[PDB]
From a paper:
Rabex-5 is a specific GEF for Rab5, Rab17, and Rab21. Rabaptin-5 is a key effector of Rab5 and plays an important role in both homotypic and heterotypic fusions of early endosomes.
In the Rabex-5CC structure, Rabex-5CC also forms a long α-helix (about 65 Å) and the four Rabex-5CC in the asymmetric unit form a tight four-helix bundle via the nonpolar surface. Rabex-5CC forms a stable amphipathic α-helix that tends to bury its nonpolar surface via oligomerization or interaction with the C-terminal regions of Rabaptin-5C212. The nonpolar surface of Rabex-5CC has good chemical and geometrical complementarities with the nonpolar surface groove of the GEF domain and thus might be able to bind there to block the substrate binding and hence autoinhibit the GEF activity as proposed by Delprato and Lambright (2007). Nonetheless, our structural and biochemical data show that although Rabex-5CC alone exists as a stable helix in both solution and crystal structure, it cannot form a stable complex with the GEF domain as shown by both GST pull-down assay and ITC analysis (data not shown).
Numbering used by the authors: 1 to 49
Amino acid sequence: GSHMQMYKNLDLLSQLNERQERIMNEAKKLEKDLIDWTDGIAREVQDIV
């Protein structure tokens, strides 16, 4: 009845939380790639200069 409807809706959090964890993972990835890019370019430019 009303309670099961309520529980099914509360349970949609599962999918939303999956998405939140994906986006957080992609932000961490991006941060690490930006750092590694910057460090890698600096080493290369130092090699040139």
